[PDB]
Amino acid sequence: KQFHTGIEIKVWAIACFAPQRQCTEVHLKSFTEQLRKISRDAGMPIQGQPCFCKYAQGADSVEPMFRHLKNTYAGLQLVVVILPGKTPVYAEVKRVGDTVLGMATQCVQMKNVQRTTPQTLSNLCLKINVKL
Amino acid sequence: KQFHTGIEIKVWAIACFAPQRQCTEVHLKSFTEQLRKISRDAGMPIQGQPCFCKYAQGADSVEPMFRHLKNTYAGLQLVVVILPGKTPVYAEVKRVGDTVLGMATQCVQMKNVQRTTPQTLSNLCLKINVKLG
Amino acid sequence: KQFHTGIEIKVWAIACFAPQRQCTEVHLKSFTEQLRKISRDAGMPIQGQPCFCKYAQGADSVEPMFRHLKNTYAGLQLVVVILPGKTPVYAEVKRVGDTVLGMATQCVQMKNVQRTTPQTLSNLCLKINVKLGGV
Ligand SMILES: Cc1cn([C@@H]2OC[C@H](OP(=O)(O)OP(=O)(O)OP(=O)(O)O)[C@H]2O)c(=O)[nH]c1=O
Ligand SMILES: Cc1cn([C@@H]2OC[C@H](OP(=O)(O)OP(=O)(O)OP(=O)(O)O)[C@H]2O)c(=O)[nH]c1=O
Ligand SMILES: Cc1cn([C@@H]2OC[C@H](OP(=O)(O)OP(=O)(O)OP(=O)(O)O)[C@H]2O)c(=O)[nH]c1=O
């Protein structure tokens, strides 16, 4: 895991499986902007707003939503998935992204979106950097 | 460029990502016959019926279908991919064919399958000729 | 036919255009070591680990990567290029290596990296040997 310098993330999406009442739109947009800033400092810029950002409920929504993403957004590079703690959703994310569709997926715990820290944003960058 | 003489396309497939309701079997068979004729006349004959011809929908279908093709038809030379206009399918077809599986692919817009003209068939032949030549 | 004696391959690189998911690090390291062994037995020893070993994707990556290689690794003798099969990358590799930069490049199919046999390693040795011998 030597860090890669050449990465640019142009097309990406957010799928929020945490409840909106806990993880609101402002929490998500705040999170997005802070993630963009750190990714820029590290020389793996996330350009742009996500091309898609929706709430969803249930592990069974993962495959349909990811197929939808792949089928709708040309060149989609990354899906960031927000999770409400321990969940069957995580398992469903992993199999679909890593073994079915071959698309980079990164999960994040809702609590790190509600109150973001540079350390957790850094962790997410490093993981994305490895994946991409 | 230079056109290449002496190419023969013996094993080829059609993957149609345009909806069947717009691009029916008879449209595809008619298209195939016209392509056969012009390619023969130009001395790069696309010989025979395709070894495979199936509909699919979505960029997500590309990799599974092409893995199937690669694994089932040894000596597959070409996949002709019919596209429904602007689509994430094109990008995925190029990624899978050129990078993932290593398979020659030529895309064609559905509107040129629904009504063929000599000029669009010629375009397609020349592209195939360059790719396989 | 005409195998060349007395060649030593000291500076060489691997550029893998097959996806990592298909052609993993262990596949590449295993392939490298097997290639070194047979090439040593045949008297064209690969003296070291490659100076560079990276994944890349797309014909558009070829020229930049090869320029990097040429400019960074003095006396680079060989680039081994792993390809998934028929691909516009093959054409671009030949154009850039043979006409743009002038460095010896040898392509190999991903399936022969994933699982080696003595016969396919031998094939690749002979081709490397031919390209490197000369004035
Ligand atoms: C089991 C479980 C785990 N997590 C954590 O969230 C992502 C983080 O790490 P990750 O898996 O993303 O780490 P990674 O090495 O990049 O590998 P994968 O993401 O491909 O699995 C993981 O530790 C949850 O939030 N909920 C859960 O229920
Ligand atoms: C860039 C782009 C192009 N097209 C056009 O539709 C078929 C035609 O095919 P093309 O002659 O380009 O040949 P192709 O097999 O697409 O591949 P190349 O070998 O030219 O790269 C291509 O120009 C799309 O439908 N979507 C796109 O996003
Ligand atoms: C489909 C495919 C096949 N092969 C075969 O494997 C050895 C030999 O090698 P190739 O003649 O293709 O290429 P090469 O030695 O670098 O030769 P030159 O182009 O310098 O003559 C070629 O017959 C590839 O290597 N790459 C492929 O993708």
GROMACS .gro file of C-alpha atoms and ligand atoms in nm:
model
  484
    1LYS     CA    1   0.000   0.000   0.000
    2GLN     CA    2   0.224   0.275  -0.137
    3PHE     CA    3   0.001   0.579  -0.187
    4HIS     CA    4  -0.087   0.662  -0.549
    5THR     CA    5  -0.040   1.020  -0.676
    6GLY     CA    6  -0.216   1.007  -1.011
    7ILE     CA    7  -0.580   0.955  -0.902
    8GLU     CA    8  -0.870   1.185  -0.992
    9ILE     CA    9  -1.227   1.098  -0.894
   10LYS     CA   10  -1.461   1.253  -1.145
   11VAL     CA   11  -1.775   1.041  -1.122
   12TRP     CA   12  -1.895   0.920  -0.784
   13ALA     CA   13  -2.214   0.853  -0.587
   14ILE     CA   14  -2.340   0.841  -0.230
   15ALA     CA   15  -2.595   0.589  -0.106
   16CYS     CA   16  -2.717   0.655   0.249
   17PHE     CA   17  -2.861   0.354   0.429
   18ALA     CA   18  -2.869   0.540   0.758
   19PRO     CA   19  -3.206   0.707   0.839
   20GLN     CA   20  -3.243   1.064   0.721
   21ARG     CA   21  -3.358   1.166   1.069
   22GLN     CA   22  -3.010   1.080   1.195
   23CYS     CA   23  -2.802   1.161   0.892
   24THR     CA   24  -2.960   1.461   0.723
   25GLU     CA   25  -2.886   1.620   0.387
   26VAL     CA   26  -2.677   1.894   0.553
   27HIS     CA   27  -2.474   1.622   0.732
   28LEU     CA   28  -2.411   1.452   0.399
   29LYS     CA   29  -2.316   1.768   0.211
   30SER     CA   30  -2.091   1.880   0.496
   31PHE     CA   31  -1.925   1.538   0.494
   32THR     CA   32  -1.886   1.551   0.114
   33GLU     CA   33  -1.713   1.889   0.120
   34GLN     CA   34  -1.472   1.793   0.397
   35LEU     CA   35  -1.387   1.470   0.215
   36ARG     CA   36  -1.318   1.669  -0.103
   37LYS     CA   37  -1.085   1.903   0.083
   38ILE     CA   38  -0.868   1.632   0.236
   39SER     CA   39  -0.861   1.436  -0.090
   40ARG     CA   40  -0.731   1.752  -0.260
   41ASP     CA   41  -0.457   1.805   0.000
   42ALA     CA   42  -0.347   1.446  -0.049
   43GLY     CA   43  -0.332   1.483  -0.431
   44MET     CA   44  -0.619   1.246  -0.509
   45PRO     CA   45  -0.883   1.512  -0.580
   46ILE     CA   46  -1.252   1.427  -0.567
   47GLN     CA   47  -1.380   1.662  -0.832
   48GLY     CA   48  -1.741   1.768  -0.822
   49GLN     CA   49  -2.056   1.689  -0.631
   50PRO     CA   50  -2.165   1.324  -0.646
   51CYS     CA   51  -2.369   1.245  -0.957
   52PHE     CA   52  -2.617   1.068  -0.727
   53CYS     CA   53  -2.706   1.092  -0.357
   54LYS     CA   54  -3.002   0.905  -0.218
   55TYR     CA   55  -3.140   0.743   0.091
   56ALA     CA   56  -3.227   0.377   0.082
   57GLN     CA   57  -3.345   0.111   0.321
   58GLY     CA   58  -3.266  -0.260   0.333
   59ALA     CA   59  -2.975  -0.480   0.222
   60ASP     CA   60  -3.199  -0.597  -0.064
   61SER     CA   61  -3.183  -0.245  -0.214
   62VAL     CA   62  -2.803  -0.264  -0.268
   63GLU     CA   63  -2.783  -0.471  -0.587
   64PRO     CA   64  -3.068  -0.284  -0.767
   65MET     CA   65  -2.926   0.053  -0.670
   66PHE     CA   66  -2.574  -0.037  -0.777
   67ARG     CA   67  -2.692  -0.183  -1.108
   68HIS     CA   68  -2.890   0.141  -1.153
   69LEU     CA   69  -2.573   0.344  -1.083
   70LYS     CA   70  -2.362   0.139  -1.325
   71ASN     CA   71  -2.631   0.158  -1.593
   72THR     CA   72  -2.695   0.532  -1.554
   73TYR     CA   73  -2.359   0.702  -1.489
   74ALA     CA   74  -2.096   0.649  -1.754
   75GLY     CA   75  -1.751   0.600  -1.607
   76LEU     CA   76  -1.878   0.581  -1.249
   77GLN     CA   77  -1.566   0.523  -1.039
   78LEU     CA   78  -1.676   0.509  -0.676
   79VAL     CA   79  -1.980   0.459  -0.451
   80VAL     CA   80  -1.958   0.582  -0.089
   81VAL     CA   81  -2.209   0.390   0.125
   82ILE     CA   82  -2.322   0.528   0.463
   83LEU     CA   83  -2.419   0.259   0.709
   84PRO     CA   84  -2.631   0.273   1.028
   85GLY     CA   85  -2.393   0.068   1.245
   86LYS     CA   86  -2.378  -0.311   1.219
   87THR     CA   87  -2.604  -0.422   0.935
   88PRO     CA   88  -2.674  -0.693   0.674
   89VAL     CA   89  -2.630  -0.399   0.435
   90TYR     CA   90  -2.252  -0.404   0.466
   91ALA     CA   91  -2.229  -0.768   0.355
   92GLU     CA   92  -2.454  -0.699   0.057
   93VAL     CA   93  -2.244  -0.397  -0.042
   94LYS     CA   94  -1.922  -0.596  -0.037
   95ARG     CA   95  -2.033  -0.886  -0.253
   96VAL     CA   96  -2.197  -0.663  -0.516
   97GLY     CA   97  -1.918  -0.406  -0.547
   98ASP     CA   98  -1.614  -0.635  -0.512
   99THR     CA   99  -1.734  -0.951  -0.684
  100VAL     CA  100  -2.036  -0.869  -0.904
  101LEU     CA  101  -1.976  -0.524  -1.060
  102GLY     CA  102  -1.605  -0.454  -1.013
  103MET     CA  103  -1.671  -0.097  -0.898
  104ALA     CA  104  -1.494   0.073  -0.607
  105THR     CA  105  -1.718   0.092  -0.298
  106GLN     CA  106  -1.627   0.246   0.035
  107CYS     CA  107  -1.844   0.212   0.346
  108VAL     CA  108  -1.854   0.468   0.624
  109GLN     CA  109  -2.029   0.452   0.961
  110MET     CA  110  -2.307   0.707   1.011
  111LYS     CA  111  -2.143   0.836   1.328
  112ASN     CA  112  -1.844   0.952   1.123
  113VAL     CA  113  -2.073   1.143   0.889
  114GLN     CA  114  -2.272   1.308   1.170
  115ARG     CA  115  -1.954   1.447   1.324
  116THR     CA  116  -1.662   1.415   1.080
  117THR     CA  117  -1.300   1.422   1.197
  118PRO     CA  118  -0.986   1.466   0.981
  119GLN     CA  119  -0.868   1.123   1.103
  120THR     CA  120  -1.174   0.937   0.971
  121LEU     CA  121  -1.170   1.134   0.645
  122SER     CA  122  -0.803   1.042   0.610
  123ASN     CA  123  -0.885   0.675   0.671
  124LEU     CA  124  -1.145   0.688   0.396
  125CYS     CA  125  -0.904   0.856   0.153
  126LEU     CA  126  -0.638   0.594   0.208
  127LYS     CA  127  -0.888   0.314   0.151
  128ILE     CA  128  -1.023   0.478  -0.164
  129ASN     CA  129  -0.666   0.538  -0.285
  130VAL     CA  130  -0.590   0.168  -0.250
  131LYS     CA  131  -0.914   0.063  -0.422
  132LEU     CA  132  -0.889   0.307  -0.712
  133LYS     CA  133  -0.451   0.313  -4.260
  134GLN     CA  134  -0.432   0.083  -4.563
  135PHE     CA  135  -0.721  -0.158  -4.618
  136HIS     CA  136  -0.614  -0.518  -4.545
  137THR     CA  137  -0.692  -0.791  -4.799
  138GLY     CA  138  -0.725  -1.156  -4.703
  139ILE     CA  139  -0.917  -1.116  -4.376
  140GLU     CA  140  -1.197  -1.369  -4.316
  141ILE     CA  141  -1.431  -1.334  -4.020
  142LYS     CA  142  -1.545  -1.686  -3.943
  143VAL     CA  143  -1.643  -1.664  -3.576
  144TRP     CA  144  -1.832  -1.357  -3.463
  145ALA     CA  145  -2.114  -1.265  -3.224
  146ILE     CA  146  -2.385  -1.007  -3.191
  147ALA     CA  147  -2.469  -0.859  -2.856
  148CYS     CA  148  -2.773  -0.632  -2.882
  149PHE     CA  149  -2.809  -0.377  -2.603
  150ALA     CA  150  -3.084  -0.192  -2.785
  151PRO     CA  151  -3.434  -0.300  -2.668
  152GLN     CA  152  -3.587  -0.579  -2.875
  153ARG     CA  153  -3.904  -0.371  -2.913
  154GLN     CA  154  -3.703  -0.124  -3.121
  155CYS     CA  155  -3.443  -0.355  -3.273
  156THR     CA  156  -3.620  -0.682  -3.347
  157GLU     CA  157  -3.485  -1.014  -3.467
  158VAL     CA  158  -3.584  -0.941  -3.826
  159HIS     CA  159  -3.400  -0.606  -3.809
  160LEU     CA  160  -3.090  -0.792  -3.690
  161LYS     CA  161  -3.110  -1.069  -3.950
  162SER     CA  162  -3.167  -0.815  -4.226
  163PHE     CA  163  -2.870  -0.611  -4.101
  164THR     CA  164  -2.657  -0.930  -4.086
  165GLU     CA  165  -2.738  -1.024  -4.447
  166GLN     CA  166  -2.649  -0.675  -4.574
  167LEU     CA  167  -2.324  -0.676  -4.374
  168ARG     CA  168  -2.234  -1.020  -4.513
  169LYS     CA  169  -2.285  -0.902  -4.870
  170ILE     CA  170  -2.083  -0.582  -4.858
  171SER     CA  171  -1.802  -0.742  -4.655
  172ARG     CA  172  -1.782  -1.022  -4.917
  173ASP     CA  173  -1.777  -0.777  -5.206
  174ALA     CA  174  -1.493  -0.584  -5.039
  175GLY     CA  175  -1.286  -0.900  -4.986
  176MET     CA  176  -1.312  -0.916  -4.606
  177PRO     CA  177  -1.600  -1.167  -4.587
  178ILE     CA  178  -1.793  -1.185  -4.261
  179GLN     CA  179  -1.876  -1.543  -4.330
  180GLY     CA  180  -2.162  -1.736  -4.176
  181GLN     CA  181  -2.432  -1.651  -3.928
  182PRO     CA  182  -2.299  -1.524  -3.592
  183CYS     CA  183  -2.213  -1.801  -3.346
  184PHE     CA  184  -2.419  -1.612  -3.085
  185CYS     CA  185  -2.688  -1.340  -3.094
  186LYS     CA  186  -2.854  -1.223  -2.775
  187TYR     CA  187  -3.026  -0.923  -2.628
  188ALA     CA  188  -2.917  -0.769  -2.301
  189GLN     CA  189  -2.999  -0.451  -2.112
  190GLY     CA  190  -2.767  -0.229  -1.910
  191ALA     CA  191  -2.395  -0.171  -1.877
  192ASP     CA  192  -2.408  -0.425  -1.591
  193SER     CA  193  -2.478  -0.706  -1.843
  194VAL     CA  194  -2.162  -0.646  -2.049
  195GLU     CA  195  -1.899  -0.826  -1.842
  196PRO     CA  196  -2.112  -1.143  -1.778
  197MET     CA  197  -2.208  -1.173  -2.144
  198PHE     CA  198  -1.856  -1.118  -2.271
  199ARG     CA  199  -1.706  -1.366  -2.016
  200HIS     CA  200  -1.960  -1.617  -2.151
  201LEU     CA  201  -1.853  -1.541  -2.510
  202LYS     CA  202  -1.482  -1.567  -2.434
  203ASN     CA  203  -1.526  -1.895  -2.248
  204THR     CA  204  -1.761  -2.060  -2.498
  205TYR     CA  205  -1.633  -1.961  -2.845
  206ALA     CA  206  -1.262  -2.031  -2.884
  207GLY     CA  207  -1.138  -1.837  -3.185
  208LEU     CA  208  -1.411  -1.573  -3.151
  209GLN     CA  209  -1.275  -1.289  -3.369
  210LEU     CA  210  -1.525  -1.010  -3.314
  211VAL     CA  211  -1.830  -0.897  -3.118
  212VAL     CA  212  -2.066  -0.655  -3.297
  213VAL     CA  213  -2.238  -0.457  -3.024
  214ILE     CA  214  -2.562  -0.275  -3.100
  215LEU     CA  215  -2.611   0.033  -2.884
  216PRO     CA  216  -2.927   0.227  -2.791
  217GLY     CA  217  -2.788   0.577  -2.850
  218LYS     CA  218  -2.586   0.755  -2.581
  219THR     CA  219  -2.528   0.500  -2.308
  220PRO     CA  220  -2.290   0.396  -2.029
  221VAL     CA  221  -2.290   0.069  -2.230
  222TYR     CA  222  -2.034   0.204  -2.475
  223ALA     CA  223  -1.782   0.288  -2.203
  224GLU     CA  224  -1.835  -0.048  -2.039
  225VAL     CA  225  -1.799  -0.234  -2.369
  226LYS     CA  226  -1.462  -0.069  -2.429
  227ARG     CA  227  -1.342  -0.133  -2.072
  228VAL     CA  228  -1.442  -0.499  -2.079
  229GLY     CA  229  -1.329  -0.576  -2.434
  230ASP     CA  230  -1.001  -0.383  -2.437
  231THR     CA  231  -0.898  -0.419  -2.075
  232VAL     CA  232  -1.072  -0.699  -1.892
  233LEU     CA  233  -1.113  -0.987  -2.138
  234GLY     CA  234  -0.914  -0.888  -2.449
  235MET     CA  235  -1.181  -0.915  -2.720
  236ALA     CA  236  -1.222  -0.720  -3.047
  237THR     CA  237  -1.551  -0.529  -3.041
  238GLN     CA  238  -1.718  -0.301  -3.290
  239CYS     CA  239  -2.012  -0.085  -3.179
  240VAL     CA  240  -2.296   0.019  -3.408
  241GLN     CA  241  -2.581   0.258  -3.332
  242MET     CA  242  -2.928   0.100  -3.326
  243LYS     CA  243  -3.056   0.347  -3.585
  244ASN     CA  244  -2.808   0.202  -3.837
  245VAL     CA  245  -2.937  -0.147  -3.769
  246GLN     CA  246  -3.305  -0.048  -3.797
  247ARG     CA  247  -3.234   0.102  -4.140
  248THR     CA  248  -2.902   0.010  -4.306
  249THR     CA  249  -2.739   0.219  -4.574
  250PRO     CA  250  -2.432   0.126  -4.786
  251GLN     CA  251  -2.241   0.418  -4.630
  252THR     CA  252  -2.292   0.307  -4.271
  253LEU     CA  253  -2.217  -0.057  -4.357
  254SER     CA  254  -1.901   0.062  -4.533
  255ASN     CA  255  -1.805   0.258  -4.220
  256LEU     CA  256  -1.846  -0.052  -4.013
  257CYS     CA  257  -1.642  -0.266  -4.249
  258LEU     CA  258  -1.353  -0.025  -4.256
  259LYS     CA  259  -1.346  -0.008  -3.876
  260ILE     CA  260  -1.353  -0.385  -3.850
  261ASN     CA  261  -1.080  -0.413  -4.111
  262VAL     CA  262  -0.853  -0.178  -3.917
  263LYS     CA  263  -0.917  -0.354  -3.584
  264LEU     CA  264  -0.861  -0.707  -3.716
  265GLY     CA  265  -0.593  -0.602  -3.965
  266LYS     CA  266   1.624  -2.029  -3.437
  267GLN     CA  267   1.946  -1.844  -3.355
  268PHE     CA  268   1.957  -1.825  -2.974
  269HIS     CA  269   2.213  -1.569  -2.851
  270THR     CA  270   2.455  -1.662  -2.573
  271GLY     CA  271   2.606  -1.419  -2.331
  272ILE     CA  272   2.310  -1.183  -2.280
  273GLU     CA  273   2.239  -1.059  -1.927
  274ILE     CA  274   1.920  -0.871  -1.851
  275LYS     CA  275   2.001  -0.625  -1.575
  276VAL     CA  276   1.740  -0.351  -1.620
  277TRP     CA  277   1.387  -0.454  -1.709
  278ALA     CA  278   1.030  -0.356  -1.634
  279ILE     CA  279   0.683  -0.506  -1.625
  280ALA     CA  280   0.380  -0.311  -1.738
  281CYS     CA  281   0.056  -0.500  -1.669
  282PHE     CA  282  -0.242  -0.392  -1.879
  283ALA     CA  283  -0.453  -0.684  -1.757
  284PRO     CA  284  -0.669  -0.596  -1.451
  285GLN     CA  285  -0.519  -0.666  -1.110
  286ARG     CA  286  -0.829  -0.869  -1.019
  287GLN     CA  287  -0.733  -1.115  -1.290
  288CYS     CA  288  -0.359  -1.091  -1.281
  289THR     CA  289  -0.268  -1.040  -0.916
  290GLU     CA  290   0.057  -0.955  -0.745
  291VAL     CA  291   0.123  -1.319  -0.656
  292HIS     CA  292   0.067  -1.421  -1.020
  293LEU     CA  293   0.318  -1.158  -1.130
  294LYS     CA  294   0.582  -1.245  -0.873
  295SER     CA  295   0.546  -1.614  -0.942
  296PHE     CA  296   0.570  -1.557  -1.316
  297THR     CA  297   0.878  -1.336  -1.270
  298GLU     CA  298   1.060  -1.595  -1.061
  299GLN     CA  299   0.978  -1.878  -1.303
  300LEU     CA  300   1.092  -1.667  -1.597
  301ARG     CA  301   1.420  -1.589  -1.416
  302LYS     CA  302   1.485  -1.955  -1.348
  303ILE     CA  303   1.436  -2.081  -1.702
  304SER     CA  304   1.619  -1.783  -1.854
  305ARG     CA  305   1.914  -1.854  -1.619
  306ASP     CA  306   1.923  -2.222  -1.718
  307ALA     CA  307   1.926  -2.119  -2.084
  308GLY     CA  308   2.220  -1.883  -2.028
  309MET     CA  309   2.035  -1.552  -2.059
  310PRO     CA  310   2.013  -1.467  -1.686
  311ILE     CA  311   1.764  -1.207  -1.564
  312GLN     CA  312   1.994  -1.059  -1.305
  313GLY     CA  313   1.734  -0.898  -1.079
  314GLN     CA  314   1.380  -0.799  -0.987
  315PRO     CA  315   1.224  -0.560  -1.240
  316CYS     CA  316   1.310  -0.197  -1.173
  317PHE     CA  317   0.944  -0.112  -1.229
  318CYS     CA  318   0.621  -0.311  -1.212
  319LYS     CA  319   0.289  -0.134  -1.249
  320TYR     CA  320  -0.067  -0.189  -1.358
  321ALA     CA  321  -0.215   0.042  -1.622
  322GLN     CA  322  -0.534   0.053  -1.829
  323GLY     CA  323  -0.601   0.176  -2.183
  324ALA     CA  324  -0.402   0.243  -2.500
  325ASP     CA  325  -0.376   0.606  -2.388
  326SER     CA  326  -0.153   0.500  -2.095
  327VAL     CA  327   0.118   0.343  -2.317
  328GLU     CA  328   0.316   0.641  -2.443
  329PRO     CA  329   0.326   0.826  -2.105
  330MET     CA  330   0.433   0.512  -1.921
  331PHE     CA  331   0.704   0.428  -2.172
  332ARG     CA  332   0.837   0.786  -2.171
  333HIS     CA  333   0.850   0.762  -1.789
  334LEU     CA  334   1.042   0.432  -1.813
  335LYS     CA  335   1.290   0.560  -2.069
  336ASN     CA  336   1.353   0.881  -1.874
  337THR     CA  337   1.383   0.719  -1.531
  338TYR     CA  338   1.572   0.390  -1.575
  339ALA     CA  339   1.907   0.434  -1.750
  340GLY     CA  340   1.998   0.136  -1.966
  341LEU     CA  341   1.647  -0.011  -1.958
  342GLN     CA  342   1.678  -0.320  -2.181
  343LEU     CA  343   1.334  -0.478  -2.187
  344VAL     CA  344   0.968  -0.405  -2.111
  345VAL     CA  345   0.750  -0.714  -2.057
  346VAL     CA  346   0.392  -0.608  -2.132
  347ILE     CA  347   0.107  -0.824  -1.999
  348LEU     CA  348  -0.206  -0.798  -2.215
  349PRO     CA  349  -0.551  -0.962  -2.172
  350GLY     CA  350  -0.558  -1.069  -2.537
  351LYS     CA  351  -0.668  -0.890  -2.855
  352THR     CA  352  -0.668  -0.520  -2.771
  353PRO     CA  353  -0.595  -0.180  -2.926
  354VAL     CA  354  -0.329  -0.171  -2.653
  355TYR     CA  355  -0.126  -0.426  -2.851
  356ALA     CA  356  -0.114  -0.201  -3.157
  357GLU     CA  357  -0.025   0.099  -2.943
  358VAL     CA  358   0.246  -0.093  -2.759
  359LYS     CA  359   0.412  -0.185  -3.087
  360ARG     CA  360   0.387   0.169  -3.225
  361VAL     CA  361   0.533   0.330  -2.913
  362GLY     CA  362   0.806   0.075  -2.839
  363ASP     CA  363   0.926   0.016  -3.197
  364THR     CA  364   0.868   0.356  -3.354
  365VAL     CA  365   0.834   0.630  -3.093
  366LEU     CA  366   1.087   0.539  -2.822
  367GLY     CA  367   1.308   0.251  -2.940
  368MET     CA  368   1.300   0.011  -2.643
  369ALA     CA  369   1.266  -0.370  -2.673
  370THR     CA  370   0.915  -0.477  -2.569
  371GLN     CA  371   0.776  -0.826  -2.543
  372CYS     CA  372   0.403  -0.883  -2.500
  373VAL     CA  373   0.263  -1.181  -2.314
  374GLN     CA  374  -0.095  -1.297  -2.273
  375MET     CA  375  -0.243  -1.275  -1.926
  376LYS     CA  376  -0.343  -1.641  -1.927
  377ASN     CA  377   0.025  -1.738  -1.950
  378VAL     CA  378   0.103  -1.521  -1.648
  379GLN     CA  379  -0.184  -1.658  -1.440
  380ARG     CA  380  -0.070  -2.017  -1.493
  381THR     CA  381   0.276  -2.083  -1.642
  382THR     CA  382   0.401  -2.394  -1.819
  383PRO     CA  383   0.763  -2.473  -1.921
  384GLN     CA  384   0.651  -2.451  -2.285
  385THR     CA  385   0.509  -2.099  -2.258
  386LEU     CA  386   0.800  -1.973  -2.048
  387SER     CA  387   1.033  -2.117  -2.311
  388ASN     CA  388   0.839  -1.939  -2.587
  389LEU     CA  389   0.876  -1.611  -2.406
  390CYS     CA  390   1.248  -1.663  -2.343
  391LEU     CA  391   1.320  -1.724  -2.705
  392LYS     CA  392   1.136  -1.408  -2.806
  393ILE     CA  393   1.317  -1.200  -2.544
  394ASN     CA  394   1.648  -1.347  -2.650
  395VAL     CA  395   1.590  -1.262  -3.017
  396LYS     CA  396   1.492  -0.903  -2.945
  397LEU     CA  397   1.792  -0.839  -2.719
  398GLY     CA  398   2.069  -0.992  -2.927
  399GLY     CA  399   2.198  -0.756  -3.198
  400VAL     CA  400   2.384  -0.441  -3.306
  401LIG     C1  401  -1.845  -0.539   0.953
  401LIG     C2  402  -1.859  -0.389   0.943
  401LIG     C3  403  -1.755  -0.307   0.919
  401LIG     N1  404  -1.767  -0.168   0.908
  401LIG     C4  405  -1.652  -0.077   0.883
  401LIG     O1  406  -1.690   0.015   0.782
  401LIG     C5  407  -1.590   0.017   0.678
  401LIG     C6  408  -1.465  -0.031   0.750
  401LIG     O2  409  -1.360  -0.077   0.664
  401LIG     P1  410  -1.384  -0.137   0.516
  401LIG     O3  411  -1.455  -0.267   0.532
  401LIG     O4  412  -1.437  -0.038   0.416
  401LIG     O5  413  -1.229  -0.160   0.480
  401LIG     P2  414  -1.132  -0.210   0.362
  401LIG     O6  415  -1.014  -0.276   0.426
  401LIG     O7  416  -1.110  -0.098   0.265
  401LIG     O8  417  -1.221  -0.323   0.290
  401LIG     P3  418  -1.368  -0.334   0.222
  401LIG     O9  419  -1.430  -0.198   0.240
  401LIG    O10  420  -1.351  -0.370   0.074
  401LIG    O11  421  -1.440  -0.441   0.300
  401LIG     C7  422  -1.523  -0.145   0.833
  401LIG    O12  423  -1.431  -0.180   0.935
  401LIG     C8  424  -1.890  -0.108   0.924
  401LIG    O13  425  -1.906   0.013   0.916
  401LIG     N2  426  -1.996  -0.193   0.948
  401LIG     C9  427  -1.991  -0.331   0.959
  401LIG    O14  428  -2.095  -0.393   0.982
  402LIG     C1  429  -1.748   0.808  -2.793
  402LIG     C2  430  -1.874   0.733  -2.829
  402LIG     C3  431  -1.902   0.697  -2.955
  402LIG     N1  432  -2.017   0.629  -2.991
  402LIG     C4  433  -2.036   0.593  -3.133
  402LIG     O1  434  -2.128   0.486  -3.148
  402LIG     C5  435  -2.073   0.382  -3.230
  402LIG     C6  436  -1.940   0.435  -3.283
  402LIG     O2  437  -1.837   0.336  -3.270
  402LIG     P1  438  -1.687   0.379  -3.313
  402LIG     O3  439  -1.681   0.404  -3.460
  402LIG     O4  440  -1.626   0.481  -3.220
  402LIG     O5  441  -1.615   0.239  -3.283
  402LIG     P2  442  -1.626   0.170  -3.140
  402LIG     O6  443  -1.655   0.025  -3.155
  402LIG     O7  444  -1.721   0.252  -3.061
  402LIG     O8  445  -1.477   0.188  -3.080
  402LIG     P3  446  -1.337   0.260  -3.119
  402LIG     O9  447  -1.249   0.150  -3.175
  402LIG    O10  448  -1.371   0.367  -3.222
  402LIG    O11  449  -1.282   0.317  -2.991
  402LIG     C7  450  -1.901   0.550  -3.190
  402LIG    O12  451  -1.839   0.661  -3.251
  402LIG     C8  452  -2.112   0.591  -2.897
  402LIG    O13  453  -2.214   0.530  -2.924
  402LIG     N2  454  -2.082   0.629  -2.769
  402LIG     C9  455  -1.969   0.698  -2.726
  402LIG    O14  456  -1.957   0.725  -2.607
  403LIG     C1  457  -0.369  -1.260  -2.814
  403LIG     C2  458  -0.222  -1.247  -2.788
  403LIG     C3  459  -0.132  -1.339  -2.828
  403LIG     N1  460   0.005  -1.326  -2.806
  403LIG     C4  461   0.098  -1.433  -2.850
  403LIG     O1  462   0.188  -1.456  -2.743
  403LIG     C5  463   0.320  -1.469  -2.793
  403LIG     C6  464   0.322  -1.395  -2.927
  403LIG     O2  465   0.370  -1.262  -2.902
  403LIG     P1  466   0.329  -1.156  -3.015
  403LIG     O3  467   0.380  -1.208  -3.146
  403LIG     O4  468   0.184  -1.123  -3.000
  403LIG     O5  469   0.404  -1.021  -2.969
  403LIG     P2  470   0.558  -0.990  -2.936
  403LIG     O6  471   0.622  -1.121  -2.899
  403LIG     O7  472   0.576  -0.867  -2.845
  403LIG     O8  473   0.607  -0.971  -3.087
  403LIG     P3  474   0.650  -0.860  -3.196
  403LIG     O9  475   0.528  -0.773  -3.212
  403LIG    O10  476   0.770  -0.787  -3.138
  403LIG    O11  477   0.685  -0.939  -3.322
  403LIG     C7  478   0.177  -1.397  -2.977
  403LIG    O12  479   0.162  -1.492  -3.082
  403LIG     C8  480   0.057  -1.217  -2.738
  403LIG    O13  481   0.176  -1.202  -2.714
  403LIG     N2  482  -0.036  -1.125  -2.698
  403LIG     C9  483  -0.172  -1.131  -2.717
  403LIG    O14  484  -0.241  -1.041  -2.674
   0.00000   0.00000   0.00000
